[PDB]
Amino acid sequence: LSATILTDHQYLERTPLCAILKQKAPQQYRIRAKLRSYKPRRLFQSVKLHCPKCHLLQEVPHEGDLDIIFQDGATKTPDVKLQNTSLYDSKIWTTKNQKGRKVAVHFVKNNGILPLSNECLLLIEGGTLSEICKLSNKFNSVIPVRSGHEDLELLDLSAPFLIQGTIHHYGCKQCSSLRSIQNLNSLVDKTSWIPSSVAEALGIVPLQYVFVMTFTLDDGTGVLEAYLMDSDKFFQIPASEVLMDDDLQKSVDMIMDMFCPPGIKIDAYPWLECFIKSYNVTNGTDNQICYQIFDTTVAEDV
């Protein structure tokens, strides 16, 4: 049987890769081919961030640069910005003999009351990623802020606008337009702060984590390179969660080994049945035919 199966377009007749390569674009094809190689090799440099509106793809920041951005924006001491108005209560920490600091934690309310804090939002100021990542596994969500002129403002959108357990929510830099922090009040779903709600309440275009790979497929009649911009449905594993998980990070590697394990014969590889949409693409200034994999997922049992 095939290692991949189509989730749609099962009515189509399979096209040989040699026939696909001469045709013009766009079209759509059903294929049954083998995976020779793929890119990238390490299945942590494949995860990217794509704006849904402007369609730009860019890299996921490694945790070191977030601490860089944190300390650069995190100021020294606030004055009036503390336990203020009808939004948050905020008692601050201190630090002695650990080189000194005053990290600030701000607890946003729920129609005046403070609810089951597994639905509670935090406005940390002056903290570090590891400290934040430990405050995100128990609390609902924490978003980094810094003391602006007279109002707490989010950091640069190169930093995540929302930390929610094992998911780091990023927005688009030029597509989004940061609004005031006070707009978190006008949030209808006051119990659960859905990431899109706080993004809309602040004017942020949320980027989604995606698997960005490139497959080299060969059915025997020809060799063809196919793209893959999977959210969650190809590996049946959600791409915004692989980077902070071991078993999620353990299965995608196992899946690609089930597809092509380097060491055995090629005719011992399992067949891959996918659906592809070809289309015309420019690179620098040269039109090219690109192939993307759609409506395809892993087979029954690994």
Q: How many Cβ atoms sit within 10 Å of the Cβ of residue 108?
A: 23
Considering the complex, state which of residue 209 and residue 275 has its C-beta at the smaller distance from Zn ion: 209
Least Cβ distance, residue 170 to Zn ion (angstroms): 11
Peptide bond connecting 26 to the previous residue in cis, omega within 30 degrees of 0: yes
Least CB distance from residue 58 to Zn ion, whole Å?
10
Q: How many CB atoms lie within 10 A of CB 260?
A: 20
Cβ-based nearer residue to Zn ion, 14 or 53: 53
> Closer CB to Zn ion, residue 157 or residue 228?
157
Nearer to Zn ion, 175 or 243 (CB): 175
Question: CB of 175: closest distance to Zn ion in angstroms?
Answer: 3
Residues near Zn ion, by CB under 5 A:
51, 53-54, 172, 175
Q: What is the nearest approach in angstroms of Zn ion to the Cβ of residue 204?
A: 10
CB of 209 to Zn ion, least distance (A): 15
Nearer to Zn ion, 105 or 172 (CB): 172
**Residue 58 or residue 183: which is nearer to Zn ion going by CB?**
58
Question: At closest approach, how far in Å is the CB of 157 from Zn ion?
Answer: 10
DSSP the chain: --SEEESS-TTSPB--HHHHHHS-SSEEEEEEEEEEEEE-SSTTSSEEEE-TTT--EEEPPPHHHHHHHHHHH--S--SS-SS-TTTEE--B---SSSS----B--EE-BTTB---GGG-EE--BS--HHHHHHHTTTSSEE--EEE-SSSEEE--TTS-SEEETTEEE-B-TTT-----GGGGSS-S--SS--HHHHHHHHT--B-EEEEEEEEEEE-SS-EEEEEEEESSTTTTS-TTTGGG-SHHHHHHHHHHHHH--BTB-GGGSPPEEEEEEEEEEESSS-EEEEEEEESEEE-S--
Nearer to Zn ion, 144 or 206 (CB): 206
Q: From the CB of 164, what's the least distance to Zn ion, in Å?
A: 21
